[PDB]
Amino acid sequence: DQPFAWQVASLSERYQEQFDIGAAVEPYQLEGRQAQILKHHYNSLVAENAMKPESLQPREGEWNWEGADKIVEFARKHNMELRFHTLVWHEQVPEWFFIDEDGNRMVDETDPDKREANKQLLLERMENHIKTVVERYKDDVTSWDVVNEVIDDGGGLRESEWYQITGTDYIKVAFETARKYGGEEAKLYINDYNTEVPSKRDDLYNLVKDLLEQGVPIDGVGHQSHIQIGWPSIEDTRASFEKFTSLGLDNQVTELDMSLYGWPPTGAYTSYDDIPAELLQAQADRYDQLFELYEELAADISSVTFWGIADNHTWLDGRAREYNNGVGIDAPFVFDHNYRVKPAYWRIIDLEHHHHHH
Ligand SMILES: [Ca+2]
Ligand SMILES: [Ca+2]
Ligand SMILES: [Ca+2]
Ligand SMILES: [Ca+2]
Ligand code: NI
Ligand code: NI
Secondary structure, three states: OOEEEOHHHHHHHHHOOOEEEEEEHHHHOOOOOHHHHHHHHEEEEEEEEOEEEEEHHOOOOOOOHHHHHHHHHHHHHOOOOOEEEOOEEEEOOHHHHHOOOOOOEEHHHHOOOHHHHHHHHHHHHHHHHHHHHHHHHHHHHHEEEEEEOOOOOOOOEEOOHHHHHHOOOOHHHHHHHHHHHHHHOOOOEEEEEEOOOOOHHHHHHHHHHHHHHOOOOOOOOEEEEEEEEEOOHHHHHHHHHHHHHOOOOEEEEEEEEOOOOOOOOOOOOOOOOOOOOHHHHOOOOOOOHHHHHHHOOOHHEEEEOOOOOOOOHHHHHHHHOOOOOOOOOOOOOEEEEEEEEEEHHHHHHHOOOOOOOO
């Protein structure tokens, strides 16, 4: 049987002078074996859920800091950089933001003058959310996901409530507000998934380039990297990183996981013991090529964060159940559900450098 994660060489050490290695965490994972693995292998953290808008301010003026603070305290004690997920997002956002002072839904307003009043009220609420969070955590966060998933998969901007009420101004104001209270030293990111898809990559590039030309402070791009064993291509990943580097932007890989399945994750395995060894080998081959690319582009990438620690906790389990009538698991990491190393661990810890020509 493979050794446990706490018995093998550190991932973060292996990528010194290349990029930090991070994990998404819940506060209840900051003890026992999961905390031991974090300290041994990772030098950067992000809150999986405790810092989302609905977690921090579920009602106006009701602040829920405890879980977020525990993650900050862990990052302080163990010398881990900390990313912030996330200041502004169309998911996991409390409904009160988009309700006017009469209890009406701003998105349904038809009077042009009340629409403008709603836009200013919503922006003030967004500004106050950002101000309060950034003032609390400024000296503990080194990468802010200021806005998340603002590009539509079908082209153009996502027509969320934020966009419906404020246009693109919520994006401009969010970055300006984060800069104002974070100071010039704060590093401000726009985060998204499928950034490797050329059409979406290009929409994100055009948005950021236009905003930079207006003086909006944007320092980098977060690539969620919710990927598969056979998709997206290394070539498309490379092109995406380089396109944002061409604007003077940092790149971070922010939510890396490699599903066993395609999309949708139909036909998922219902137990880890049913996963064929050849599939874990294919995952290992792909992770090898992926981290070889990251090494190639290490000047362009400051950190690579996995959206979890080991296979026993991943949002991909819930996704598998969604498309398989409530049953199914996924195994996206280099540490398996019992914290034992997987073939992918060996393939991204090693110093292999013989290339894979065909
Ligand atoms: Ca079975
Ligand atoms: Ca780097
Ligand atoms: Ca799992
Ligand atoms: Ca390797
Ligand atoms: Ni670092
Ligand atoms: Ni290789």
